[PDB]
Amino acid sequence: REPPVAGGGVPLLGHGWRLARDPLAFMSQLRDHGDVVRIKLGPKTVYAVTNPELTGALALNPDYRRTIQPAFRLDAIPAYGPIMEEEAHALTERWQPGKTVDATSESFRVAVRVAARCLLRGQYMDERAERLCVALATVFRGDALADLHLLVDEIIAERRASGQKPDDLLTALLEAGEQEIHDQVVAILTPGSETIASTIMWLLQALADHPEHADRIRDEVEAVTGGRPVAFEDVRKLRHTGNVIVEAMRLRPAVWVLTRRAVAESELGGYRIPAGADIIYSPYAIQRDPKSYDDNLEFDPDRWLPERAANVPKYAMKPFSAGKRKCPSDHFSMAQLTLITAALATKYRFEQVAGSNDAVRVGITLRPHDLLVRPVARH
Ligand code: HEM
Known about the structure:
Cofactor: Mg(2+); Ca(2+); Mn(2+); heme
Largest sheet: 5 strands, mixed
Order of helices and strands: EHHEEHHHEHHHHHHHHEEEEHHHEEEE
Radius of gyration: 21 Å
Structural class: alpha+beta
Strand order of the largest sheet: 1-2-3-8-5
CATH class: Mainly Alpha
Distance between the termini: 64 Å
Strand content: 5-15%
Shape: globular
EC number: 1.14.15.39, 4.2.3.47
Keywords: Heme, Iron, Lyase, Magnesium, Metal-binding, Monooxygenase, Multifunctional enzyme, NADP, Oxidoreductase
Number of strands: 12
CATH architecture: Orthogonal Bundle
Helix content: 40-55%
Number of helices: 16
PDB class: oxidoreductase
Subunit structure: Homodimer.
Bound molecules: protoporphyrin IX containing FE
């Protein structure tokens, strides 16, 4: 039993400084300092787990509301399918060749609408929800909140009329506290939207930077779909489309850090994690770690090919985690992302507008500072 090794920082806020200068770089660095190292954020110490084996142990160990399970299981997503198809193909018209797409603005919107319309059905939260959620997300980076609370309440009050078959979360949430619901709703929809949105931005970036897969995706879709606009059933066949998304998520994951708190004194990789300790780890660094991945920084959707897939460590690619603090929408996420990607790559070809700033901006989630793309007519 040995305590973790310290890294290298300054006076009042040791690692706090190297951390703020370049979060992403700091996290990828930690990796070599050892499987687990101790870093000081100002006065308090935190533990950093940088190994795929210990990070899995970290998420699967409970030492760090099934209500929600019935709305996100694989069985409740085939029912959301229509709204997913609907929202996707609607983007396909909404965007037209020649006009640049404002990724931040447009990705955030598709995100809110898919989430809100599948997880809630009826009186539309159309642009109102989007805007409130917009003004808010920007407050974080560097009259909306009220509306958000206003609308969340008002919307709940309307399903109270007739919400018979609504297998959505809202009805799942109404059959388990008065304000607890309003909060468990506001709490689930908020992150999930910004999260899927940031992911969409990187997908748009992938389709413009790699026309080869963009089209390969169009080929795979046309085969399966014939010509009919892609549908849920189709998504379960579009393999390549799925690989592109994973590969894009691996190199640029919306959630790049994760935290845990030790309840009981623990042991990890032969190291002693003090009871009540604050621990941290970066899916970002794990997914881009040379010891886990062959072509470490090479966009390659085909590394997820059976043969090479098995070459990569067990928990080295876990955009969502394993234990209960996992992502309920893992199925619901990939399902809408797959649909939107296939719908977009089939109809279009993407190109980045000169002046586009696809540089990563580290905030709540990782996202491109100012990605500008233009859909070009494919066939
Ligand atoms: C861009 C795709 C997504 C990714 C990569 C993702 C990833 C994650 C991760 C890594 C966690 C927690 C892990 C931890 O701290 O232990 C989480 C939690 C959660 N996510 Fe997702 N997520 C995505 C989309 C969504 C969507 C669309 C929703 C629904 C609006 C959603 C709702 C939630 C909820 C409610 C939790 C909390 C679970 C708990 O309390 O244990 N997520 N997600």
